[PDB]
Amino acid sequence: SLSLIAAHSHITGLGLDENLQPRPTSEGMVGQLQARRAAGVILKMVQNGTIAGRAVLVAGPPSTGKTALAMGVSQSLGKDVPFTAIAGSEIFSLELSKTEALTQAFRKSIGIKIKEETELIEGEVVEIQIDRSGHKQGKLTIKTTDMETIYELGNKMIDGLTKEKVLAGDVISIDKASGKITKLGRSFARSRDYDAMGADTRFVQCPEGELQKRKTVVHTVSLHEIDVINSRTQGFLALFTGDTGEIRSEVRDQINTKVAEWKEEGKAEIVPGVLFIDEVHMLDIECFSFINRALEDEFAPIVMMATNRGVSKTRGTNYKSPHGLPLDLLDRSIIITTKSYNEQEIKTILSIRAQEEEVELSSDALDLLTKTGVETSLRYSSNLISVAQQIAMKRKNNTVEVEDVKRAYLLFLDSARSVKYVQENESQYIDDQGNVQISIA
């Protein structure tokens, strides 16, 4: 995937053993042993696929691995298991209601693996002979790399051939169920015949193997995609534009019934996934009341929620809540907590980040960065690493040292020093009341 080195680019997954016992450092994660155990238990719950509609809350101080834990869960899940990560503010739209946005998010987190059986004949047509008066009759020859057979054509087949304007050297595919004819391309022997080629023309080889083939193909389509396709007459365009509107409830019920019928017949399989809502405290009370009932569904996915606020005010209400969330939602949610790191864990995290950013830190520089991290913040030192690397490179030195980190510390401030400077010079910065002294003398 197109990517650059990002904040969570080093997490290959939860470093869990066979017994769901975390390793001290593995797959790019350090510490948080209890939280990683809980995340692994939730991951195995997702993988089993029997339990439906479970809410998980991730709580802890900021910069403590909540989003890191979610990234690890996503990486462990891998592909073929949907994982929709959205922010708290993303659901607010001018087109969709909040309930509709949450419904679409929930349906995106469930995937349907559907099997379609197709029987086809493919080959390069060698000779076509058509006789017409009464109805017409004709014979046709199609060859493969190791087969050749002459077929007799009905009147409708001849009509289809004529309306497709098939000539010799063309590779075509016919569905014996409907008789529809699709022109794959032309043979290589006809390439020399022209100097400029039309937009439609394509040169393809002669297909190998048997002329008539049976094949089954599995497609991964989310529930939301099925709803959008079956809503309008061209919904698959809305799957890209996003102008889907508030899909009818009866459409969703029909799609649920259709998926159940397919699952009974064994041509569709359900692969439940994980819905991750970042910063759930930005949601409203209406959204939470919807989520409470949404989880009580057979098709409902497993919802992961990450919050950092303690006793804060729930949006849309006039009262404070234990995590910024109403008690009813907290009742139906199991909580995974995170713990602040010590010096050694911060040192290991900084070393991992330096390795990911291909920056060769020194021992003294690493110690200084660890001290700054424990004094101020982990993200501050993590961001200082690359700036120090650039300063060192400007000094035509291939390794970073204490002087480069010191210069990076001096140039780029943190939250504490910025607050100190804004408080020392309150008169030159605009305040809540709007007063500011632009003049100096």
Binding site: V126, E127, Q129, D131, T162, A168, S187
Partner: peptide, 28 residues
């Protein structure tokens, strides 16, 4: 028919209910 005349029998049965090659192609 308008002069109170019956139509052709085969045409009647067809209307109640409703050799040489013409195209040959071969790759050289």
């Amino acid at each position: 028919d308008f002069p109170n005349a019956p139509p052709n029998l085969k045409d009647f049965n067809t209307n109640l209910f409703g050799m040489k090659t013409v195209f040959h192609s071969i790759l050289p």
